Design a binder for this molecule. Structure first.
Ligand code: HEM
Ligand code: HEM
Ligand SMILES: N#Cc1ccc(CCNCc2ccc3ccc(N)nc3c2)cc1
Ligand SMILES: N#Cc1ccc(CCNCc2ccc3ccc(N)nc3c2)cc1
Ligand SMILES: C[C@H](O)[C@H](O)[C@H]1CNc2nc(N)[nH]c(=O)c2N1
Ligand SMILES: C[C@H](O)[C@H](O)[C@H]1CNc2nc(N)[nH]c(=O)c2N1
Ligand SMILES: [Zn+2]
Lengths: 413, 408
């Protein structure tokens, strides 16, 4: 690969030069002969695999604190190396853990919210041993992050993987999600995305209310044990009913959503250590709710019902009745959150902030990996600045990774 | 390996084998994806490229290894020897052009690929000849509003010093003017080309939607200006079916999108002049042409007429005015019986086309970044469709703007 790669913004004509890509650690799944940029996803580590990965990260850490090659650096390397030799693993210091978490976010090419990366509250839950404790740590996370509507981003990090048979896992895909129930007649009640997880919860003993917006219980696995159910205290679950500034009837749709998006099934990888349970949270971009959660056909799918109430001509697509309904729904979402003083960002502000963030990263870091397919918002793409912005995608570590759903791999005790 | 692609709405999984046939690079590597980057001869090189194309041509007509296949190959080799190049048969030219369209990863309109009217203009020698072929193209393709897809193919490149080039980026475009106050009148995307035409002697009406003259270069010579006969230029006045004030905006557009600056590559041969046309997807005009910042940039004016709250962005006033503009464009063209397609119909057709290509061809190269429409993305099926992108030949390639290469 060449040392410099340039990206252009076709709207402002700004050219940026990327050197950071040289530090790319893993495969994209693309090759010289095929691109996989629209593909969704294109037994532990050994001693000898782990030494270079740890050293890679420790060097990076001491470089960031302007202490590279120092006595402390060399001593840290020595300590880590001896630990790997005598335990087949090592323990990050609190500083390294915080650094690592923040940089995994900073490195998330698909995240448009990264201007905020350095402001992340890191909760160290490496002393956890049980599922009740995981629940305690998660309740505190939710309360702190929610902050009565003034949301603050956070992550809670559970003990790293050891032999792979003692993994800590949050089985929920987010800490807060709505149940989906498949009906005998083929119809789905609730959120069709969560039908499987809902069924698993019901099997472990959850008594479902069988409603449209039932907050799911936490299903938590500690130390490789069977997972346990806990109900989140409802006072900790901030929710927003959806209404519209102009349409009085919109409240009658009975919509609501939760304030706190909190992804809980990703793997955090730092210096070759694997944190299989690392629930993190920030706040919502409106389109995630107004376009995807609400208007996807395999989701709540409300376009038709909203369109009917708007009295739109729904017999021609070329009337763009879908597009019209889609805008209003996204207005109602933003209006509802702002009126209830719950943090949310519209897709224009967010993309504009990201362009600023990306430019700053090119200047101070030599680049900023970004996945245009994910960064561009699901509606009104070209009237946001990121549509016009060339991006380079590559994988830096520390990183957040996907992992198999735990029910697919768990050995029941 | 065989690769799978999934649609996340329908869970339909298709299997790609076609990608194994490509030999041109994408610009990506194992370590860096460049899917959002806009742009990532000798006898010696010439024959195998020619040989490959003949092979696939004769393999497509179920006569691979035939006497004619063998003879044609001999014929082509002997010709590259004795002339440093070769000439495509009519049949091959038509097949080549349809397949460049078919292999065009960014085109959402490819379900139409095999219905392409091919005009062979390889006997052209002068810019006057070019003008005549182009007038015939425009007239045939416009067809009183019932548009028909077409391509006109001018002589292939020889030495680079005798290129045929259409200097216009599209046969029909509007002028853009730099005003004394630093603002732009008309289409800002065309300000450079407009000044080149003015320098050449074109008398500008200096209005908002002035049809630019053709600038035609034959055989490496200086380009010549030509006025398209007005009666051949179909235009649509944009009005809204509910907002009776929308016509007051004075917006119009042309019916015929006819891209004229690309390069058609067939069997190693280079056609630097190959203007082609189909018809519009509404968003091209209603989202990009009208609402881009660097273009007509009408969003603000429209939202004012809609009396929207424009003090905060979270009112989505931009998004509202955008949908209304695009409704107007679709309504206007349809009311005037001018062929057009909305982005829901077009993306649906594409998903169907993809399925056809996987079934009969083992794949379909597709550029998600380009296929997904610039508005209402995830409420169209292509957003949720995984795609594989790879470069197959024959193809349409970009080429440098001719005013950067030409010595006068
Ligand atoms: C603070 C406000 C934040 C905003 C506005 C934001 C915005 C977004 C959005 C809109 C996506 C696309 C996801 C989708 O469409 O489903 C995304 C992806 C992602 N974000 Fe952020 N985010 C924020 C905070 C965070 C934080 C705190 C972290 C981790 C510490 C994070 C890590 C990620 C990762 C790893 C992805 C990729 C998800 C995937 O591949 O499935 N984000 N972000
Ligand atoms: C018949 C109706 C057609 C429709 C509705 C259609 C639609 C589109 C659209 C919306 C684009 C994106 C272009 C942009 O946003 O600037 C595109 C790209 C493209 N189309 Fe089609 N198209 C049609 C016909 C054709 C024909 C007849 C050809 C050639 C014979 C063709 C070849 C291409 C190529 C090469 C591109 C990529 C150009 C680039 O990379 O800049 N299309 N098409
Ligand atoms: N099928 C499927 C399928 C669809 C989406 C995803 C990824 C969803 N991740 C969403 C996500 C992740 C992190 C976020 C951080 C902040 C925020 N506001 N939203 C965030 C949203 C995976 C599988
Ligand atoms: N700067 C810039 C810049 C902007 C756009 C493009 C690509 C333009 N291609 C437009 C294009 C090409 C072929 C088409 C075929 C049919 C159709 N309806 N539209 C079509 C539109 C290149 C450079
Ligand atoms: C097929 C395609 O890769 C898939 O639908 C992607 C497209 N871009 C996305 N972008 C975001 N932000 N979130 C998503 O879930 C997706 N889905
Ligand atoms: C940077 C990015 O590749 C560029 O803006 C592309 C994005 N996708 C596009 N898609 C279409 N259909 N047309 C375009 O001009 C572009 N522009
Ligand atoms: Zn790629």
């Amino acid at each position: 690969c060449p040392r410099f790669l340039k990206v252009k913004n076709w709207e402002t004509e700004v050219v940026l030069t990327d050197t950071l890509h040289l530090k790319s650690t893993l495969e994209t799944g693309c090759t010289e002969y095929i691109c996989m940029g629209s593909i969704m996803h294109p037994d532990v580590a050994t001693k000898d695999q782990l030494f270079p990965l740890a050293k890679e990260f420790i060097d990076q850490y001491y470089s960031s604190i302007k202490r590279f090659g120092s006595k402390a650096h060399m001593e840290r390397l020595e300590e880590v190396n001896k630990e790997i030799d005598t335990t087949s693993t090592y323990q990050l210091k609190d500083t390294e853990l915080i650094y690592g978490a923040k940089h995994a976010w900073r490195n998330a090419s698909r995240c448009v919210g990264r201007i905020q990366w350095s402001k992340l509250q890191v909760f160290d839950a490496r002393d956890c041993t049980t599922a009740h404790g995981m629940f305690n740590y998660i309740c505190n996370h939710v309360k702190y992050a929610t902050n009565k509507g003034n949301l603050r981003s956070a992550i809670t990090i559970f003990p790293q993987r050891t032999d792979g048979k003692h993994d800590f896992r949050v089985w929920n895909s987010q800490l807060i999600r709505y149940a989906g129930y498949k009906q005998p007649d083929g119809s789905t009640l609730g959120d069709p995305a969560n039908v499987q997880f809902t069924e698993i919860c019901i099997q472990q003993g959850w008594k479902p209310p069988r409603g449209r917006f039932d907050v799911l219980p936490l299903l938590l696995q500690a130390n490789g044990n069977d997972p346990e159910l806990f109900q989140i205290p409802p006072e900790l679950v901030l929710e927003v009913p959806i209404r519209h500034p102009k349409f009085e009837w919109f409240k009658d749709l009975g919509l609501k959503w939760y304030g706190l998006p909190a992804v809980s099934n990703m793997l955090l990888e730092i210096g070759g250590l694997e944190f299989s349970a690392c629930p993190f949270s920030g706040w919502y971009m409106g389109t995630e709710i107004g376009v995807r959660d609400y208007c996807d056909n395999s989701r709540y799918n409300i376009l038709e019902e909203v369109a009917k109430k708007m009295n739109l001509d729904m017999r021609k697509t070329s009337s763009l009745w879908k597009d019209q309904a889609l805008v209003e729904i996204n207005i109602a979402v933003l209006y509802s959150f702002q009126s209830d003083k719950v943090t949310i960002v519209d897709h224009h502000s967010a993309t504009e902030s990201f362009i600023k963030h990306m430019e700053n990263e090119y200047r101070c870091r030599g680049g900023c990996p970004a996945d245009w397919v994910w960064i561009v918002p699901p509606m009104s793409g070209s009237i946001t600045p990121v549509f016009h912005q060339e991006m380079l995608n590559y994988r830096l570590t520390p990183s957040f990774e996907y992992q198999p759903d735990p029910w697919n791999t768990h050995v029941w005790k």
